[PDB]
Ligand SMILES: Cc1cc2nc3c(=O)[nH]c(=O)nc-3n(C[C@H](O)[C@H](O)[C@H](O)COP(=O)(O)O)c2cc1C
Ligand SMILES: Cc1cc2nc3c(=O)[nH]c(=O)nc-3n(C[C@H](O)[C@H](O)[C@H](O)COP(=O)(O)O)c2cc1C
Ligand SMILES: CC[C@@H](C)c1ccc(-c2nc3ccc(Br)cc3c(C(=O)O)c2C)cc1
Ligand SMILES: CC[C@@H](C)c1ccc(-c2nc3ccc(Br)cc3c(C(=O)O)c2C)cc1
Ligand SMILES: CCCCCCCCCCC[N+](C)(C)[O-]
């Protein structure tokens with residue numbers, strides 16, 4: 235907590251004052267991958283353990299996709315205290331993404347707007363990087379620290395479904411779960427894959443490919459959705475998920491909306507908005523998807539989590555696990571232990587024996 | 600905290616299971632007014648004290664209008680640990696309000712929908728009730744526990760401005776601050792008084808009447824606004840407030856919106872929605888009004904506050920004081936001490952010397 239205060243009040247604001255956010259991002263990935271951070275002090279208690287998606291998670295707090303896009307910092311992220319790590323999005327071929335600048339801080343809103351556009355080292359590079367530590371990961375996974383891989387589509391792809399199928403074939407065998415990212419606001423036409431008929435065709439193909447993998451190399455498949463869906467869109471997704479036996483949902487990606495009240499000078503930049511202004515939009519989307527799937531489909535809740543209260547609100551709304559990203563950029567590494575310690579305190583205060591007991595609790599009130 | 604858990608987990612859910620919400624409301628007012636609650640244990644520290652609106656507030660946590668509509672429970676509310684009490688809305692003549700049922704719980708959303716329609720004992724009854732304890736209130740106020748009076752308009756009023764003027768004349772001399780409630784979603788035509796030209800005419804008249812009161816009986820005047828305003832509406836309110844020297848704003852009343860994701864069976868009932876689903880809508884409205892008024896106009900922040908984090912988010916967005924109501928209905932009296940204790944902890948954790956230092960802090964980031 236002295237550490238928490240030092241990072242939040244001194245170190246992070248200073249780094250943000252010195253570097254543009256993309257440079258700071260690159261440096262953070264480098265520092266994390268070199269293990270230069272001291273190992274997090276918080277010791278995960280048994281009440282934080284969750285069993286879902288065919289795996290044990292030592293704690294329910296993960297790092298969201300987009301921080302480690304290319305799988306370079308996975309071990310340093312576990313060292314920070316994350317219960318699970320998701321890398322990506324990874325596209326089949328390497329691609330540069332959008333021209334710079336393409337990421338913007340909104341400090342007054344504790345938010346970020348990004349339009350990276352799936353900058354990716356590509357499947358082949360990431361495959362080799364993961365293969366180099368594959369057995370180390372197998373041990374981590376067995377110890378309750380799973381790895382997720384988030385798949386995207388190349389900008390010039392003439393067949394979206396084949397892009398995702400290729401990712402299943404190449405990175406599926408290296409992942410505990412795969413995410414079909416059909417919700418980036420930064421690749422033209424992508425979010426239209428959330429529509430009923432596309433989504434059914436796409437996910438049938440993804441699931442066929444996944445089912446074709448050898449048993450020990452067969453990941454769970456999750457779909458990551460936008461916070462900007464119509465009620466019709468959400469009903470349709472819920473129906474397809476149940477029809478096909480999709481293993482879970484990630485709720486939500488960034489928003490293309492700009493909520494009333496944003497103060498940052500850069501609020502009108504094109505891109506997806508993340509952080510505090512997204513928080514309750516995400517929570518409400520979790521609540522809706524949990525109800526539509528009858529609580530039978532595991533949800534990873536993401537968007538604006540920066541405290542134990544934020545985490546518990548998403549868990550009570552229906553999330554089995556949560557992720558954060560934007561909070562790390564403002565508060566630094568100590569935010570992980572902060573969220574975990576506050577979550578444990580609140581679980582006890584509200585009479586929950588553990589995280590598992592709190593999942594979807596608001597729906598039973 | 601054992602008390603907190605008993606109320607939240609046992610007592611309150613049991614009362615809610617036994618009584619319709621209007622009956623429970625009536626019983627709560629009666630019990631509070633009889634002092635039947637034990638006096639709250641939390642001792643207000645100096646870091647919670649705020650000086651604003653020409654008064655000292657021992658702590659920044661108030662009870663919002665609509666709980667004690669007729670000024671029957673003011674002393675019992677201070678006993679609960681509220682730093683200030685707001686009664687009302689009070690209409691010039693007595694009126695029954697809407698037919699029953701007119702209030703609805705949404706337990707799955709931690710929300711309420713109400714359409715009371717300004718049920719009021721009227722000015723004359725409330726005047727006598729306040730006069731009976733006027734000197735007791737003068738001492739409370741001097742000790743840092745001010746009283747606000749919220750004014751409404753009768754359903755059949757042929758002249759809204761004169762309704763508010765009458766309230767200023769009759770209850771102004773008994774109040775530390777008055778609130779011109781132009782934001783009830785439950786009286787036809789009322790919210791149109793938020794428009795620039797009406798509002799200017801109305802508030803000029805209110806301020807003239809207030810200025811006509813003797814110095815020691817001259818209250819601050821605040822305007823309470825909706826969370827459903829357009830950007831144009833908010834710009835216009837900010838402009839009128841500065842043009843006329845209005846003393847403060849109360850942000851916000853209940854919403855006529857129904858955010859995506861509401862789960863309660865009663866979500867489609869007509870009325871204003873309060874509680875958790877309103878929280879971030881309110882916070883964003885505070886953020887916007889603070890910026891539009893350059894931080895020079897005190898804001899009382901209200902909508903979905905049930906924790907110290909909720910309170911601090913509104914303070915950092917620009918609120919000098921906060922109020923709650925809906926949280927009390929789910930968590931009971933211990934929620935007041937809970938909010939205060941958590942707020943104090945968070946202020947220390949974030950390096951604020953006191954509440955005053957945190958006011959509008961997000962705008963300086
Ligand atoms: C800079 C940045 C890059 C991102 N890249 C990706 C990505 O490649 N794939 C993806 O599925 N989500 C991506 N996201 C979205 C996050 O995974 C997460 O859904 C979103 O930011 C909400 O969480 P937060 O508010 O905690 O940041 C990115 C977010 C940010 C801020
Ligand atoms: C049952 C009920 C009655 C209310 N009556 C009034 C009222 O008479 N005047 C008023 O200005 N606001 C009234 N409100 C609004 C509250 O003062 C407050 O602005 C709103 O409920 C948001 O706060 P909360 O989420 O903490 O309840 C009422 C709210 C509720 C739930
Ligand atoms: C790994 C070192 C710690 C101290 C660290 C953590 C996060 C950051 C950081 N990461 C970002 C990632 C993505 C984006 Br977009 C922005 C950042 C920023 C930033 O806001 O500049 C920071 C500081 C920098 C350093
Ligand atoms: C004053 C006694 C304490 C224990 C108490 C506090 C609040 C309530 C209460 N107040 C309400 C006020 C307005 C509305 Br609308 C509803 C309530 C409810 C309720 O949800 O039924 C309660 C329980 C009941 C008892
Ligand atoms: C036309 C060239 C396409 C190759 C794309 C390059 C890989 C993506 C760039 C990510 C940034 N990087 C970490 C390499 O510096």
Ligand SMILES: CCCCCCCCCCC[N+](C)(C)[O-]
Nearest residue numbers: 669693694695696718719720721
């Ligand atoms: C036509 C009769 C108008 C008189 C209105 C009565 C006062 C408002 C009712 C509030 C409920 N009460 C607390 C009295 O039971």
Ligand SMILES: O=C(O)c1cc(=O)[nH]c(=O)[nH]1
Nearest residue numbers: 350351352418420488506
């Ligand atoms: O690469 C990006 O632009 C990106 C992808 C994504 O899924 N979400 C996001 O906010 N940005």
Ligand SMILES: O=C(O)c1cc(=O)[nH]c(=O)[nH]1
Nearest residue numbers: 715716717783785853871
């Ligand atoms: O009496 C009511 O109906 C009422 C008034 C008000 O200002 N706000 C509200 O939600 N209800």
